[PDB]
Design a protein around this ligand. Sequence first.
Ligand code: ZN
Ligand code: ZN
Ligand code: ZN
Lengths: 134, 9
Amino acid sequence: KVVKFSYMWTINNFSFCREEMGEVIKSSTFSSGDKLKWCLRVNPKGLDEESKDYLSLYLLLVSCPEVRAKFKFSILNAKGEETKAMESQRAYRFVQGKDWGFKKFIRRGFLLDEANGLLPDDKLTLFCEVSVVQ
Amino acid sequence: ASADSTTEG
Ligand SMILES: [Zn+2]
Ligand SMILES: [Zn+2]
Ligand SMILES: [Zn+2]
């Protein structure tokens, strides 16, 4: 009894400068079809010492009218393929305002490397796949 | 990998 859906978030004018980027940016909401609204939450720069060289990615339950779900995050490169995918082993319990994710999703050093093609035209494209347990 | 949350509980 699983409902699986996804959302592609393109972040424009990506910058490594906090005073320009903001410490926290969220995507617009999305769902499977569905009253449950979800959104992605990114910390361009990890908000703690252990994740300071990383970009943090979380899945947030915006509105809930109490829910368990698995998720997977991946970056879409310049040619549309999935890379640096990170998925939760199990499902986690979400309630309104609660998030789950990886504070060390990807190295801020990796994004800079143009060789990876992770920031085409200063655009970061993230793809999230959510599986809600019924 | 193991997921984490920005909040406790
Ligand atoms: Zn700066
Ligand atoms: Zn600046
Ligand atoms: Zn996929």
